[PDB]
Each structure stands twice: as C-alpha cells, then as structure tokens.
Amino acid sequence: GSVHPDLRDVFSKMSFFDKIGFLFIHAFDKRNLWHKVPVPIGLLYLNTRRTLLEKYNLLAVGRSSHGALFDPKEFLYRTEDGKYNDPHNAEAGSQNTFFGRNMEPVDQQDELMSPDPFVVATKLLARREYKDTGKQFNILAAAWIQFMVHDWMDHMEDTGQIGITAPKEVANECPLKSFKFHPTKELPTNSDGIKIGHYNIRTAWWDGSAVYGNNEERAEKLRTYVDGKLVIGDDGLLLHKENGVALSGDIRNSWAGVSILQALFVKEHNAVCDAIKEEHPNLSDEELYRYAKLVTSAVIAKVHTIDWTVELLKTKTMRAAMRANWYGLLGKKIKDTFGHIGGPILGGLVGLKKPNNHGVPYSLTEEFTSVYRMHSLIPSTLKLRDPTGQPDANNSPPCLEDIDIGEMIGLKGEEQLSKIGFEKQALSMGYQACGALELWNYPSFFRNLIPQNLDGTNRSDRIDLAALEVYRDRERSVPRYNEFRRRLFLIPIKSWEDLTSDKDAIETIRAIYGDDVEKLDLLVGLMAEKKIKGFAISETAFNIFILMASRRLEADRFFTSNFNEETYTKKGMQWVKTTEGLRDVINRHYPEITAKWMKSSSAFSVWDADY
Ligand code: HEM
Ligand SMILES: CCCCCCCCCCO[C@@H]1O[C@H](CO)[C@@H](O[C@H]2O[C@H](CO)[C@@H](O)[C@H](O)[C@H]2O)[C@H](O)[C@H]1O
Ligand SMILES: [Ca+2]
Ligand SMILES: [Cl-]
Ligand SMILES: [Cl-]
Ligand SMILES: [Cl-]
Ligand SMILES: [Cl-]
Ligand code: NA
Ligand code: NA
C-alpha cells in the first residue's frame, strides 16, 4: 500500500503527469515532512501541490459560458462594482455573483443541528485561559485580516428569519439563551453542474473595496470630488453619519481596529493623489481617483502578500514562497530593474503578460470563507499605551488603562475610538499580541453580539457568533473537517489523537462527537489541528490559501497584463514598487510613533519583537 486508501480512487483516475505530482507531495505528507526540509524542496512541494489543486479544486457555480462582451481597452481602471476585469466575462468578480466552490458540496440538511451549535460553542470554542501568539502577530494583524474580509466576501441573506435555542445542558453557560438570524440566500444556478449557489455581495477582486465601496452608489458618498480624494476627519479618523455609521468602503460588522486601517488607507490614497497630480497637473478628479485606486489597492495586495502572510506563516519556506508569488523566484532586484522574466515561477504572478484563471471564471469560494473564520484572533482586553509616555520597565510605551474590546466594537466602538485617537489605538494594537487560533479562545463578547444590516445600522436580534459560524458551514454544504482534508489531497484523521495531542481536547471532542471523526465540524478541526512550527493557522486552511491567494493575483488583469506604468502612471507604479509592508505606510503618515516605538521589521509583529 503506497497511496493512502482514501486517495486511491482519485489517484487511479489521474493523468500520468498528475500521478507524478501526487506521489511527490504524498511522499512528504505520509511522513509530515514538507515543512521540515530546506527551502528549495519545500517550494517544489508547494508548487506541485498548487498545480494539483488548480486542476481539481476550482469548481464553477452558475453557467460559465456567455458573459457580456466588451473591449478591455475601454476599462483600464477598477470599476466601482468590480465588473469588466476579465475580457471573457464582464460579470466575473463583481458584486452579486455566485461564490464558486473548491469542493463538491456535501448536503447536510438533515444534520444542521448535529451536534448542537450551542454545545459546540460552549464546550469547545468559548475562551478559557487566554492564548496569544507571543511576539509573532499583533492586533494590527488581527484587524488587517478583517479589513481584508470586508474587501472580499459577504453572503447575501434571505429576508426571512429563523431561530435556534440553547439546550438545557448548556443554557446556563450561554450568554444568549436563543437567537434569530437570516438564512443564507439560495439561488438556483440554472446550470448542469452544481444546482444551488450563494451570492457574494462584496466584489471578489482585490480592489480596495473596504475603502472605496462595493458599487457606484456607495462609492460616490466617500469622495470629495476634488483631486480624486476621499473624505477623512481632521483627527485622521473616519467621518461618521448622524446615525453613527462610518463613512468608508465597507463598514458592516466592524470594530475600531479595522476603522483605523481604513482611515490610514484613506490617507494613503489621498497622498497618492497628491503625488500623481504633481507629475500630471492636468488630470481630472476622476482620472486621479482611478489611478490612486489602482495604486492603493495594489499596495494593499502587496502588504498582505509579502508582509502579513509572511508573519502569519513564520518560516523560511513561506517567506520565500510568498515573495516568489509577488516578485518571482528571480527576486525583487531583477524584477524591479528588468521587469517580469520567465513564467509565473521565475517572474511571479504579478506582471504576467496575461491573466490566467485556469479554465474557471474568477470568484472567491465558499471554502475560502470557511477557512478565514478567525474570530479567536481578537483578544479580550486592549492595553492602551501612551504614545509620548516614558518607557516602562521594558522599553515599551507605558500602559494607561485596560479597556474591554467588547466596548471597541460596532457603533459604540466608533464612539470610543473618537476619544482615543489614531496614534494611541495603533500603538496599543502594535504592542499587544493577538489571540491564537486554538480551541477555547473565542471571545465572550462575540457570543452576545449585535449584528448589523447592510447599511451599517444595528439589528435588534443579537447573535451567538460561535454557534452561528458552525451553523453556517453546515448550512452552506461545506464538507466537514475530515472530508475537507480528503478533497484537498490531505491525509484524513483515523482517530482524535491524529488531530491533536492535547488530552483535554480529545476528551471534550469525544463527549460531543463520539468517535465519529466524520462528524467533526470544520471550524472545530481547523482550530484544534496541531500546528506547523511558526504557522498561526492549520495546514488544512493553508491549503485553501495556496490555491486562492495565488488566484487573487493571477486572475486579475490589473495585477497582470495591466500592471504597468501606462495603467498606473509612472509615479503610481513607483509608489507600489517602493512600498514593502504596513511599516512603510504607517511611517509615511505617522513617522513619529514609528521612530519612537516600532522596533520590529514588520508592523504586524508585536512592535518590540527582536527581528
Ligand atoms: C470585532 C471583530 C469582529 C466582529 C464584530 C465580526 C462580526 C461578524 C459578523 C456579525 C459576521 C456575520 C455572521 C453571519 O451572519 O453569518 C461575521 C462573519 C465573518 N467574519 Fe467576522 N467579525 C469580527 C472579526 C473578524 C476577523 C478578525 C475575521 C478574520 C478573518 C473575520 C472573518 C469573518 C468571516 C470569514 C465571516 C464570514 C463572512 C461570510 O459569510 O461571507 N471576522 N463576522
Ligand atoms: C515524455 C513523457 C511522455 C508522456 C506520456 C504520458 C502518457 C499518459 C498521459 C495521460 O495519462 C493517462 O491519463 C488518463 C486520464 O486522462 C488516465 O486514465 C485513468 O483515469 C481515467 C479517469 O480519469 C479512467 O478512465 C482510466 O481508466 C484510468 O486509467 C490514465 O490512467 C493515465 O495513464
Ligand atoms: Ca473587493
Ligand atoms: Cl525577493
Ligand atoms: Cl517560470
Ligand atoms: Cl490569503
Ligand atoms: Cl512591486
Ligand atoms: Na497527525
Ligand atoms: Na530590518
């Protein structure tokens, strides 16, 4: 028996060339070796795994043929709703389009409540001893990833409501004894393959929509209509409407941490507007907006790719891998001087002569949503520090007060932030570790949370988010943990002890799920899975990232065929090329806290990290 019994069927159907790739990665996987080898072999492994996933784990939802026809040269900018990127598909990546899938759906209609979402939430997710990431990853990094989800994906809801009630066995430990919510909207695909789909009400393109808006009706509200600029308050914080809702791109179900990143990137955009106007004085407001949006959205993609992900996956192999996606294996020096050389590996995904969607129209997917459910990253309390205080017993800015992060959330949080200010919020977030993605680390304020409508206003029905998330994965027919692994050519668990060596986790899991490893929910598995050294996430989630993070760059005209001076302006392109991370953005606008307190290379590391 060479191949794992559960992957023999798919192996036997593979082409000769896919068989070779499978056997290569599987040789490492059977011995858990890919991340224990030197960088060059690790990269070969990752590229081989990626190619396999691109072939087997991109599934269209909704008819792929047709699509409105247009001239790409009449759309050399990022449209407000994300349309007109893909020359062969004007709708691809735009607002209100189907989520794709990475795997065939698994119907769970008869087990939507098995085991009970409140039991799962209470016994497995609810924060006990707080666990953080040490120096590796800070609260800016937790905020960053939510800021990105607001740039990426949100499921259209059904107008009706349903409700669930905590069973007597755990009701006493539940902050809410029941709650209502809207089911995920189901739309018929009218297609041969998958029959039911869900809509993404955000643009799937990496287009800065968290700052710019998800369509034209939204985007117009945020612009000054002078020099291409966006509105911002004199304190350097977002403006607010009279109902308390923030004036930015996507402000739904947010907190203060996201609000400061949005405000920071408003200033980034406006500073790009200044720089470009300087080189091209006769540009209109509209032209300046378009160029600055291209630059700023590219800056965001870049920061996420070669800074955030690099600190999230803190290994030599992943630094090399992520930099290779952006700059190419030939490296930054060659890329910057001589442009893109060779194919996707040597020159990188960015600056490819043509976009490549690998035969399947661009979309974000149901499973991409699932693996990005990282609410346990939010700490329980924020230690506020003094930007001009005397350095304490360490060389840290001194602590002024602990504040409960539940007070920093939603409309109330916008009010609290208006009293704290940017520098204090940012510095304090920089100097504190975020939470680890482990069992028993889901914040209690999420279990008693006020959700918001599309317009940012509060809903009167609070939710238990831990419980809801477990419900959403089942509701949307995402395979449960073990099958999820199988579909990605990963070795499934046979017993609980294959998942984790923590005895209490094993015992708690057994009492809820029995010994049926097929019943284990995805979210529970992703949090519980024993982690690769340096990895803040599970290997399982990482596999979706391998595929989809590449896809977000490779499928986009504006990171590929139109990643050039003609589309971005010369100054615009130079701005992207000379920005390497969030540090560079924070330094541009807030050089004094950066000089005084940012000691780490990356602004995503706890700011006194020694590297
Ligand atoms: C204060 C912090 C946060 C709040 C208040 C918040 C709130 C929410 C709410 C209300 C939902 C909708 C649940 C539903 O109706 O199904 C949601 C979904 C989600 N959140 Fe958060 N969240 C926070 C932080 C984060 C962070 C740090 C991440 C990191 C990746 C994240 C990722 C997601 C994802 C992936 C979804 C599912 C979205 C979808 O269905 O398309 N959130 N969040
Ligand atoms: C310089 C090097 C020269 C290169 C020569 C390469 C020749 C082989 C390339 C494709 O390999 C074949 O691909 C088929 C799939 O397209 C496989 O069918 C397999 O899978 C099919 C299902 O996909 C089943 O119908 C078949 O029974 C099953 O054998 C078949 O096994 C495999 O050998
Ligand atoms: Ca977007
Ligand atoms: Cl490099
Ligand atoms: Cl190449
Ligand atoms: Cl990613
Ligand atoms: Cl660059
Ligand atoms: Na194992
Ligand atoms: Na350095």
XYZ file of C-alpha atoms and ligand atoms in Angstrom:
694
model
C 0.000 0.000 0.000
C 1.827 3.056 -1.313
C -1.053 5.551 -1.535
C -3.457 6.237 1.344
C -6.615 4.089 0.906
C -8.848 7.198 0.875
C -6.919 8.767 -2.044
C -6.508 5.606 -4.175
C -9.693 6.173 -6.177
C -8.721 9.693 -7.296
C -5.075 8.645 -7.889
C -6.172 5.819 -10.206
C -8.139 8.322 -12.312
C -5.279 10.811 -12.598
C -3.279 11.506 -15.717
C 0.280 10.242 -15.744
C 1.593 13.759 -15.069
C -0.808 14.378 -12.170
C 0.126 10.949 -10.715
C 3.764 12.064 -10.596
C 2.901 15.286 -8.749
C 0.597 13.491 -6.349
C 3.206 10.870 -5.487
C 5.783 13.576 -4.877
C 3.704 15.563 -2.374
C 2.240 12.379 -0.837
C 5.721 11.032 -0.111
C 6.251 14.078 2.102
C 2.703 14.065 3.574
C 2.799 10.458 4.758
C 5.778 11.415 6.925
C 4.789 15.017 7.696
C 7.997 16.297 6.077
C 7.223 19.139 3.626
C 7.906 21.863 6.224
C 10.952 20.102 7.695
C 13.039 20.298 4.530
C 15.232 23.078 3.104
C 13.536 25.894 1.214
C 14.124 24.758 -2.398
C 12.487 21.364 -1.831
C 9.661 22.969 0.196
C 8.934 25.327 -2.689
C 8.906 22.474 -5.206
C 6.430 20.689 -2.919
C 4.214 23.770 -2.691
C 4.246 24.443 -6.434
C 3.421 20.771 -7.135
C 0.563 20.807 -4.610
C -0.737 24.128 -6.026
C -0.892 22.823 -9.622
C -2.878 19.806 -8.459
C -5.354 21.984 -6.536
C -5.738 24.316 -9.533
C -6.759 21.339 -11.635
C -9.031 19.525 -9.156
C -10.321 22.191 -6.764
C -11.683 25.030 -8.863
C -15.419 24.422 -9.426
C -17.651 26.923 -11.239
C -21.053 27.859 -9.834
C -23.580 29.192 -12.367
C -23.309 28.928 -16.153
C -19.757 29.794 -17.294
C -20.493 30.434 -20.989
C -21.685 33.767 -22.422
C -20.963 36.803 -20.185
C -21.313 40.337 -21.562
C -18.832 41.296 -24.313
C -16.543 44.325 -24.149
C -13.249 45.907 -25.092
C -10.679 45.653 -22.255
C -9.021 48.840 -23.530
C -12.176 50.807 -22.640
C -11.810 49.701 -18.984
C -8.268 50.447 -17.814
C -9.391 51.054 -14.225
C -11.132 49.258 -11.376
C -14.886 49.726 -11.764
C -16.992 50.540 -8.687
C -18.762 47.160 -8.744
C -15.828 45.012 -9.947
C -17.215 44.382 -13.447
C -15.156 44.408 -16.671
C -11.968 42.853 -15.370
C -11.988 39.515 -17.218
C -12.203 40.137 -21.027
C -14.161 36.871 -21.417
C -16.544 37.595 -18.532
C -17.691 41.104 -17.625
C -19.537 39.765 -14.534
C -16.633 37.786 -13.037
C -15.553 39.097 -9.621
C -18.305 41.733 -9.446
C -20.892 42.452 -6.753
C -23.790 39.975 -6.538
C -22.251 36.955 -8.250
C -22.098 33.317 -7.168
C -19.473 32.101 -4.763
C -17.515 29.363 -6.510
C -16.501 26.166 -4.759
C -13.228 24.354 -4.119
C -15.059 21.068 -3.500
C -18.330 19.369 -4.375
C -20.941 20.426 -1.840
C -21.949 17.971 0.907
C -25.659 18.207 1.720
C -26.112 18.493 5.490
C -29.792 19.487 5.613
C -30.660 16.587 7.962
C -27.831 17.335 10.403
C -27.764 21.151 10.520
C -28.078 20.867 14.330
C -25.971 17.717 14.991
C -24.206 18.157 17.299
C -25.855 21.289 18.716
C -24.174 24.582 17.684
C -24.524 25.963 21.258
C -22.916 22.822 22.722
C -20.002 23.129 20.271
C -19.672 26.846 21.021
C -19.873 26.438 24.797
C -17.717 23.352 25.284
C -15.091 23.730 22.528
C -14.887 27.382 21.410
C -15.634 29.647 24.410
C -12.474 31.353 25.685
C -10.978 29.832 28.877
C -7.305 30.566 29.604
C -6.471 33.273 27.093
C -3.906 32.166 24.493
C -1.950 34.637 22.390
C 0.730 34.396 19.693
C 3.660 35.818 21.713
C 5.573 38.287 19.523
C 4.636 36.807 16.166
C 1.369 38.525 15.411
C -0.263 41.624 16.918
C -3.728 43.247 16.978
C -2.997 45.281 13.823
C -2.593 41.891 12.154
C -5.956 40.729 13.560
C -7.514 43.951 12.287
C -5.776 43.618 8.925
C -7.373 40.277 8.147
C -10.904 41.520 8.943
C -10.150 44.636 6.842
C -9.410 42.147 4.010
C -12.601 40.093 4.511
C -14.502 43.408 4.090
C -12.541 43.793 0.826
C -13.537 40.269 -0.264
C -16.692 38.458 0.767
C -20.118 38.691 2.367
C -23.031 36.267 1.847
C -26.416 37.554 0.618
C -29.115 36.840 3.204
C -32.684 35.618 2.900
C -35.187 38.272 4.102
C -36.922 35.751 6.392
C -35.655 34.731 9.824
C -35.110 31.512 11.726
C -34.025 30.864 15.303
C -32.196 28.371 17.476
C -32.448 27.703 21.207
C -29.666 26.557 23.531
C -30.408 23.119 25.001
C -30.826 22.756 28.766
C -27.465 21.005 29.086
C -25.543 24.224 28.291
C -28.112 27.061 28.556
C -26.710 28.177 31.903
C -23.321 28.790 30.236
C -24.715 30.615 27.190
C -24.796 34.443 27.212
C -27.838 34.188 24.898
C -30.484 31.530 25.532
C -31.638 31.709 21.918
C -31.212 33.961 18.896
C -32.637 34.717 15.473
C -30.840 35.263 12.175
C -31.385 35.283 8.396
C -30.663 32.084 6.444
C -28.124 32.288 3.658
C -29.953 33.129 0.433
C -30.219 30.235 -2.034
C -30.316 30.999 -5.762
C -30.796 28.414 -8.489
C -27.793 28.165 -10.847
C -29.913 27.004 -13.835
C -26.810 25.051 -14.743
C -25.688 21.488 -15.477
C -23.318 21.015 -12.526
C -23.966 22.442 -9.055
C -27.645 23.421 -8.778
C -27.860 25.874 -5.849
C -25.500 28.763 -5.160
C -24.992 31.643 -2.763
C -24.189 35.241 -3.755
C -21.225 37.354 -2.701
C -22.458 40.899 -2.066
C -18.878 42.231 -1.996
C -16.551 42.390 -5.012
C -14.237 39.358 -5.058
C -11.436 41.292 -6.786
C -8.642 42.646 -4.624
C -9.807 46.194 -5.392
C -9.696 48.118 -2.092
C -13.491 47.977 -1.759
C -13.123 48.130 2.032
C -12.057 51.719 1.388
C -13.782 52.563 -1.916
C -17.195 50.854 -1.691
C -18.803 47.787 -3.278
C -20.644 49.691 -6.049
C -21.078 53.198 -7.531
C -23.992 54.210 -5.302
C -21.785 53.591 -2.244
C -18.514 54.955 -3.693
C -19.835 58.423 -4.559
C -20.620 59.131 -0.860
C -16.948 58.900 0.096
C -15.332 61.161 -2.469
C -14.561 64.870 -2.159
C -14.690 65.119 -5.957
C -11.549 67.264 -5.857
C -8.154 65.869 -6.917
C -9.523 62.282 -6.764
C -9.597 62.352 -2.966
C -11.667 60.674 -0.271
C -13.202 62.211 2.848
C -11.426 61.967 6.219
C -11.741 63.787 9.562
C -9.186 66.296 10.866
C -8.203 63.877 13.654
C -7.151 61.377 10.942
C -10.176 59.185 11.718
C -13.120 58.299 9.510
C -16.055 60.700 9.396
C -19.447 59.447 10.575
C -23.038 59.906 9.513
C -25.583 61.188 12.034
C -26.695 57.610 12.760
C -23.124 56.833 13.914
C -22.163 54.745 10.852
C -18.663 55.350 9.465
C -18.001 56.898 6.067
C -15.845 54.253 4.406
C -15.983 51.436 1.862
C -17.462 48.524 3.760
C -18.265 49.202 7.363
C -20.511 46.262 8.245
C -19.889 44.296 11.478
C -16.627 46.151 12.096
C -14.650 47.384 15.101
C -12.214 50.204 15.882
C -9.113 48.292 14.707
C -10.498 47.989 11.185
C -11.618 51.650 11.281
C -8.079 52.894 11.840
C -6.733 50.752 8.927
C -9.461 52.197 6.713
C -8.546 55.729 7.861
C -4.849 55.012 7.244
C -5.545 53.841 3.699
C -7.750 56.854 3.017
C -4.703 58.977 3.785
C -2.590 56.657 1.641
C -4.983 57.144 -1.298
C -5.022 60.924 -0.868
C -1.225 61.077 -0.641
C -1.043 59.063 -3.883
C -3.485 61.597 -5.387
C -1.032 64.378 -4.446
C 1.962 62.545 -5.889
C 0.265 61.760 -9.202
C -1.255 65.228 -9.651
C 2.273 66.599 -9.186
C 3.559 64.609 -12.181
C 0.376 65.153 -14.228
C -1.124 68.527 -13.238
C -3.961 68.463 -15.788
C -5.620 65.208 -14.688
C -9.278 65.407 -13.741
C -10.684 64.387 -10.363
C -11.983 61.211 -11.985
C -8.639 60.316 -13.582
C -6.802 60.928 -10.311
C -9.297 58.750 -8.381
C -8.851 55.918 -10.856
C -5.064 55.925 -10.766
C -4.889 56.278 -6.968
C -7.356 53.396 -6.507
C -5.186 51.162 -8.727
C -2.094 52.119 -6.679
C -3.717 51.820 -3.269
C -5.453 48.505 -3.977
C -2.093 47.190 -5.266
C -0.349 48.452 -2.120
C -2.903 46.547 -0.039
C -2.400 43.325 -2.045
C 1.364 43.733 -1.715
C 1.307 44.372 2.031
C -0.899 41.316 2.561
C 1.232 39.063 0.343
C 4.840 39.857 1.386
C 4.320 41.205 4.921
C 1.132 39.939 6.609
C 1.235 36.362 5.261
C 4.962 36.183 5.925
C 4.424 36.922 9.641
C 1.322 34.695 9.751
C 3.364 31.780 8.356
C 6.643 32.452 10.090
C 9.022 30.032 8.340
C 11.862 30.373 5.866
C 9.968 28.402 3.225
C 6.892 30.614 3.352
C 8.862 33.862 3.218
C 10.426 32.537 0.023
C 7.101 31.263 -1.301
C 5.172 34.482 -0.758
C 7.944 36.669 -2.122
C 8.103 34.363 -5.179
C 4.381 34.898 -5.827
C 4.900 38.658 -5.803
C 8.448 39.190 -7.149
C 9.272 35.844 -8.764
C 11.973 33.352 -7.793
C 14.446 35.551 -9.682
C 13.840 38.145 -6.960
C 12.989 41.805 -6.359
C 16.225 43.294 -7.661
C 15.772 41.598 -11.055
C 12.002 42.238 -11.124
C 12.398 45.948 -10.331
C 15.212 46.518 -12.815
C 14.340 44.278 -15.745
C 10.615 43.606 -15.281
C 8.863 40.236 -15.329
C 11.089 37.424 -16.688
C 10.093 33.830 -17.450
C 6.785 32.395 -16.341
C 4.815 32.534 -13.087
C 7.628 30.922 -11.086
C 10.650 32.922 -12.251
C 8.904 36.286 -12.718
C 5.993 35.850 -10.318
C 2.246 36.094 -10.640
C 2.401 39.900 -10.576
C 3.269 41.305 -14.013
C 2.392 38.180 -16.002
C 1.706 39.192 -19.615
C -1.835 37.742 -19.307
C -4.259 36.837 -16.524
C -4.852 33.116 -16.019
C -7.970 31.697 -14.369
C -7.119 28.050 -15.107
C -10.327 27.462 -17.083
C -12.713 28.535 -14.316
C -14.153 32.073 -14.065
C -12.715 34.092 -11.188
C -14.606 34.017 -7.897
C -13.992 33.667 -4.198
C -15.348 30.415 -2.835
C -17.457 29.001 -0.052
C -14.465 27.217 1.468
C -12.330 30.376 1.353
C -14.961 31.950 3.603
C -14.795 28.958 5.964
C -11.023 28.902 6.443
C -10.988 32.634 7.130
C -13.294 32.295 10.138
C -10.665 33.548 12.594
C -12.656 35.315 15.334
C -10.454 33.838 18.065
C -7.722 36.287 16.980
C -9.455 39.122 18.909
C -8.148 39.499 22.473
C -10.486 40.067 25.403
C -8.942 43.364 26.519
C -6.801 46.069 24.924
C -3.894 47.529 26.906
C -3.921 51.234 25.930
C -0.454 52.842 25.934
C 0.914 56.416 25.932
C 2.475 57.494 22.607
C 4.673 60.050 24.445
C 4.976 58.357 27.833
C 8.321 57.495 29.398
C 9.491 53.952 28.511
C 8.499 51.428 31.229
C 10.495 48.539 32.853
C 10.796 47.282 29.279
C 11.314 49.932 26.587
C 7.579 49.868 25.869
C 5.290 52.884 25.918
C 3.713 52.800 29.373
C 0.237 51.399 29.991
C -2.546 53.875 30.822
C -5.546 51.528 31.203
C -7.015 48.172 30.143
C -10.140 48.514 28.001
C -12.606 45.709 27.249
C -12.587 45.042 23.490
C -16.347 44.486 23.586
C -16.530 48.268 24.077
C -14.477 48.821 20.868
C -16.928 47.007 18.591
C -19.503 48.407 16.137
C -21.241 51.787 16.571
C -20.196 52.071 20.231
C -16.628 51.315 19.210
C -16.639 54.187 16.738
C -17.565 56.430 19.687
C -14.796 55.060 21.924
C -12.221 55.402 19.160
C -13.206 59.076 18.693
C -11.961 59.580 22.276
C -8.767 57.525 21.927
C -7.325 58.726 18.615
C -5.277 57.057 15.893
C -1.805 57.082 17.429
C -2.945 55.671 20.773
C -5.115 52.998 19.156
C -2.446 51.966 16.625
C 0.440 51.935 19.084
C -1.565 49.946 21.605
C -2.592 47.436 18.938
C 1.056 47.228 17.812
C 2.323 46.473 21.337
C -0.137 43.659 22.023
C -0.218 40.073 20.712
C -3.432 38.882 19.062
C -5.180 35.644 20.063
C -4.113 32.196 18.869
C -6.358 30.041 16.662
C -6.785 27.225 19.160
C -9.714 25.630 20.965
C -11.257 27.503 23.920
C -10.267 31.010 22.725
C -13.398 32.518 21.148
C -14.149 35.887 22.880
C -17.258 36.067 25.088
C -18.423 39.346 23.515
C -18.930 37.501 20.200
C -21.400 35.193 21.953
C -23.636 38.159 22.801
C -23.049 40.294 19.701
C -25.130 42.947 17.939
C -25.065 42.213 14.198
C -25.605 44.949 11.603
C -27.689 45.479 8.469
C -26.196 46.221 5.048
C -26.344 49.943 5.819
C -24.243 49.533 8.998
C -27.135 50.038 11.460
C -27.762 47.735 14.406
C -30.141 44.791 14.320
C -32.219 44.199 17.435
C -31.582 40.413 17.300
C -28.220 39.686 18.920
C -26.371 36.510 17.870
C -24.055 33.882 19.276
C -21.415 34.035 16.521
C -19.539 30.911 17.607
C -22.789 28.961 17.333
C -23.793 30.711 14.108
C -20.466 30.029 12.354
C -20.731 26.290 12.996
C -24.285 26.507 11.626
C -23.240 28.493 8.509
C -20.637 25.914 7.381
C -23.249 23.132 7.576
C -25.985 25.312 6.031
C -23.808 26.148 3.031
C -22.902 22.458 2.424
C -19.170 22.899 3.090
C -17.701 19.471 3.832
C -16.944 18.740 7.462
C -13.332 18.550 8.646
C -12.168 15.082 7.544
C -13.805 15.088 4.122
C -12.483 18.660 3.667
C -8.961 17.309 4.090
C -9.647 14.402 1.638
C -10.879 16.808 -1.045
C -7.559 18.690 -0.825
C -5.436 15.510 -1.129
C -4.595 15.590 2.596
C -4.418 12.523 4.828
C -7.616 12.292 6.914
C -7.553 11.544 10.652
C -8.408 7.992 11.818
C -8.754 8.956 15.464
C -8.846 12.096 17.590
C -5.213 11.538 18.519
C -4.190 12.172 14.884
C -5.725 15.650 15.154
C -4.098 16.782 18.381
C -2.078 15.543 21.352
C -3.970 17.715 23.858
C -5.763 15.173 26.078
C -8.484 17.616 27.223
C -9.340 18.483 23.624
C -9.538 14.803 22.731
C -11.804 14.131 25.722
C -14.053 17.163 25.151
C -14.356 16.342 21.445
C -15.218 12.692 22.232
C -18.014 13.636 24.654
C -19.663 15.749 21.920
C -18.894 13.883 18.669
C -18.249 10.335 19.961
C -15.637 8.522 17.860
C -17.181 9.537 14.542
C -14.330 11.550 13.002
C -16.596 12.289 10.016
C -18.906 14.340 12.297
C -16.220 16.784 13.459
C -17.092 20.278 12.270
C -14.642 22.117 10.072
C -14.197 25.116 12.353
C -13.508 22.870 15.347
C -10.941 20.867 13.373
C -9.207 23.953 11.978
C -8.784 25.439 15.488
C -7.792 22.137 17.122
C -5.344 20.849 14.483
C -1.757 20.608 15.743
C 0.194 23.409 14.085
C 3.327 23.555 11.976
C 6.047 25.410 13.886
C 5.738 29.119 13.039
C 2.286 28.670 11.470
C -0.520 30.619 13.103
C -3.016 28.614 11.046
C -3.801 24.961 10.413
C -2.305 23.115 7.451
C -5.838 22.371 6.277
C -6.760 26.097 5.989
C -3.325 26.762 4.475
C -4.189 24.508 1.509
C -7.118 26.688 0.535
C -4.734 29.696 0.862
C -2.138 28.077 -1.502
C -4.768 27.976 -4.234
C -6.826 31.100 -3.614
C -4.070 33.553 -2.650
C -2.337 32.841 -5.960
C -5.647 33.091 -7.793
C -6.430 36.575 -6.425
C -3.321 37.870 -8.172
C -3.068 35.636 -11.248
C -6.685 36.025 -12.403
C -6.715 39.848 -12.197
C -5.898 41.981 -15.277
C -4.597 44.769 -13.070
C -2.018 42.588 -11.332
C -1.018 41.050 -14.670
C -1.485 42.363 -18.225
C -2.245 45.882 -16.948
C 0.280 46.003 -14.064
C 2.323 48.661 -15.868
C 3.207 52.366 -15.984
C 0.657 53.053 -18.712
C -2.195 51.857 -16.482
C -0.896 53.103 -13.090
C 1.207 56.115 -14.180
C 4.962 56.098 -13.748
C 4.725 57.664 -10.276
C 1.848 55.355 -9.317
C 3.905 52.278 -10.226
C 6.969 53.591 -8.349
C 4.766 54.063 -5.276
C 3.735 50.380 -5.382
C 7.295 49.248 -6.116
C 8.820 51.126 -3.155
C 6.249 50.033 -0.527
C 7.188 46.715 1.128
C 4.833 46.461 4.099
C 2.492 48.127 6.567
C 5.533 49.684 8.313
C 6.113 51.783 5.166
C 2.508 53.007 5.136
C 2.393 53.821 8.855
C 5.781 55.612 8.567
C 4.557 57.757 5.691
C 1.680 59.184 7.761
C 2.809 58.645 11.366
C 6.624 58.780 11.319
C 6.983 59.806 14.971
C 5.384 56.785 16.719
C 7.200 54.661 14.125
C 10.580 56.154 15.002
C 9.942 56.102 18.742
C 8.212 52.740 19.253
C 8.269 50.487 16.138
C 11.377 48.342 16.682
C 10.264 45.232 14.735
C 10.898 44.930 10.978
C 7.246 44.252 10.411
C 4.458 46.396 11.761
C 2.496 43.108 12.117
C 4.920 41.705 14.709
C 4.465 42.847 18.290
C 6.359 46.145 17.928
C 9.181 45.221 20.374
C 9.951 41.890 18.688
C 13.709 41.461 18.249
C 13.564 40.877 14.474
C -14.710 42.696 16.395
C -14.419 41.828 15.436
C -15.424 41.157 14.579
C -16.794 41.227 14.541
C -17.686 42.080 15.426
C -17.233 40.357 13.493
C -18.581 40.134 13.160
C -19.031 39.239 12.193
C -20.392 39.010 11.877
C -21.601 39.634 12.540
C -20.433 38.101 10.867
C -21.678 37.558 10.191
C -22.120 36.202 10.756
C -23.298 35.665 9.965
O -24.380 36.315 9.904
O -23.203 34.556 9.374
C -19.095 37.761 10.557
C -18.729 36.905 9.549
C -17.387 36.696 9.248
N -16.288 37.203 9.865
Fe -16.243 38.438 11.331
N -16.177 39.781 12.937
C -15.054 40.208 13.519
C -13.726 39.874 13.243
C -13.328 39.018 12.228
C -11.991 38.666 11.978
C -10.747 39.105 12.740
C -12.014 37.799 10.891
C -10.754 37.271 10.339
C -10.643 36.680 9.160
C -13.383 37.633 10.472
C -13.874 36.869 9.439
C -15.232 36.677 9.197
C -15.677 35.775 8.115
C -14.807 34.982 7.160
C -17.022 35.783 8.154
C -17.987 35.046 7.248
C -18.430 36.051 6.165
C -19.361 35.469 5.119
O -20.294 34.695 5.451
O -19.209 35.756 3.899
N -14.148 38.390 11.322
N -18.247 38.469 11.363
C 7.691 12.388 -22.262
C 6.641 11.669 -21.455
C 5.592 11.061 -22.357
C 4.253 11.304 -21.715
C 3.352 10.118 -21.870
C 2.177 10.296 -20.956
C 1.068 9.373 -21.355
C -0.049 9.446 -20.331
C -0.730 10.801 -20.144
C -2.122 10.637 -19.556
O -2.167 9.556 -18.657
C -3.397 8.852 -18.575
O -4.451 9.717 -18.220
C -5.729 9.113 -18.137
C -6.758 10.135 -17.696
O -6.921 11.111 -18.721
C -5.703 8.010 -17.115
O -6.924 7.313 -17.147
C -7.260 6.878 -15.861
O -8.301 7.696 -15.413
C -9.453 7.736 -16.219
C -10.409 8.626 -15.468
O -9.854 9.938 -15.414
C -10.013 6.344 -16.390
O -10.978 6.393 -17.423
C -8.937 5.374 -16.815
O -9.458 4.058 -16.775
C -7.768 5.462 -15.872
O -6.709 4.639 -16.299
C -4.589 7.040 -17.383
O -4.610 6.107 -16.326
C -3.279 7.801 -17.484
O -2.214 6.933 -17.801
Ca -13.131 43.780 -3.305
Cl 12.761 38.847 -3.421
Cl 8.535 30.259 -14.665
Cl -4.554 34.904 1.811
Cl 6.134 45.739 -6.698
Na -1.281 13.750 12.714
Na 15.155 45.047 9.305
